[PDB]
Design a binder for this molecule. Structure first.
Ligand SMILES: *[C@@H]1O[C@H](CO)[C@@H](O)[C@H](O)[C@H]1NC(C)=O
Ligand SMILES: *[C@@H]1O[C@H](CO)[C@@H](O)[C@H](O)[C@H]1NC(C)=O
Ligand SMILES: *[C@@H]1O[C@H](CO)[C@@H](O)[C@H](O)[C@H]1NC(C)=O
Ligand SMILES: *[C@@H]1O[C@H](CO)[C@@H](O)[C@H](O)[C@H]1NC(C)=O
Ligand SMILES: *[C@@H]1O[C@H](CO)[C@@H](O)[C@H](O)[C@H]1NC(C)=O
Ligand SMILES: *[C@@H]1O[C@H](CO)[C@@H](O)[C@H](O)[C@H]1NC(C)=O
Ligand SMILES: *[C@@H]1O[C@H](CO)[C@@H](O)[C@H](O)[C@H]1NC(C)=O
Length: 200
């Protein structure tokens, strides 16, 4: 049961991903890595022939891919477009083909976000000011930080636009504190400048 493992599963842009191979048969004739779930000649990335110990790039090669004698495929200077499935073809000594599949995801290196307010001078007795992390990004998870702690879940803490927008239904002067926003993707995360609440 040939299997493939992508180490790491998630990779930031510009780094490299190494695909490992397990349960490799004892008798082998050659390997081949193809872009996509289907073994097709046009999608061949690289091939290796144990008999002649020759490694030859395929039509889909871009110079960033190298094949090791242990069937491991190394891709350097990865990019977002590389996110997809990869299939390994193993040719046994008897030339009967055995296939396997693997995948990995590429994610951007997010920047520190920013916060904007729809009201800059909250009314002390009550107000419905709204906060939002403006630099919207895909497949990102938003976290709101208040007073150096996670937001206390309460109905007064409304959320919108998924939860990229945080609205305090009823503000109070006791709510004064540092307001900070974080974005985290499967690979990286850091926070924004803490905004303050104005009252007197
Ligand atoms: C395969 O060979 C490369 C280069 O020596 C190495 O980095 C990698 O860990 C090896 N993988 C396995 C499963 O042996
Ligand atoms: C990585 O890819 C980018 C875009 O082609 C290029 O500008 C950069 O020089 C490459 N870096 C390396 C070490 O190959
Ligand atoms: C930290 O923020 C800076 C600038 O916004 C950005 O270059 C970097 O990708 C971020 N690093 C992490 C681990 O989130
Ligand atoms: C703007 O701030 C005021 C403060 O009371 C609030 O009533 C209103 O709902 C907010 N509108 C938006 C789009 O955030
Ligand atoms: C408080 O702020 C610091 C950064 O200034 C941060 O490292 C720390 O995790 C925060 N503490 C809590 C409980 O969130
Ligand atoms: C924000 O939206 C995401 C959607 O997956 C959810 O997982 C998360 O629990 C939400 N956070 C809050 C405080 O509602
Ligand atoms: C505000 O915080 C102070 C802390 O001593 C507390 O005594 C007071 O009851 C709070 N007022 C309201 C309206 O929550």
């Amino acid at each position: 049961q040939l299997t493939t493992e992508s180490m790491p599963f998630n990779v930031a842009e510009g780094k490299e991903v190494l695909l490992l191979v397990h349960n490799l048969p004892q008798q082998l004739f050659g390997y081949s890595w193809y872009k996509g779930e289907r073994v097709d000649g046009n999608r061949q990335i690289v091939g290796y022939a144990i008999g002649t110990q020759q490694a030859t790039p395929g039509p889909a090669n871009s110079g960033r891919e190298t094949i090791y004698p242990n069937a491991s495929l190394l891709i350097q200077n990865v990019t977002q477009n590389d996110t997809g499935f990869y299939t390994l073809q193993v040719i046994k000594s008897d030339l009967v083909n055995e296939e396997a599949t693997g995948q990995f995801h590429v994610y951007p290196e997010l920047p520190k976000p920013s916060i904007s307010s729809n009201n800059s001078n909250p009314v002390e007795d009550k107000d419905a000011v709204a906060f939002t992390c403006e630099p919207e990004t895909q497949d990102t998870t938003y976290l709101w930080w208040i007073n150096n702690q996670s937001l206390p879940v309460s109905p007064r803490l409304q959320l919108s636009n998924g939860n990229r927008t945080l609205t305090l239904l009823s503000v109070t002067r006791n709510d004064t504190g540092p307001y900070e926003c974080e974005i985290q993707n499967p690979v990286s995360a850091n926070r924004s400048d803490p905004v303050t609440l104005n009252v007197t």
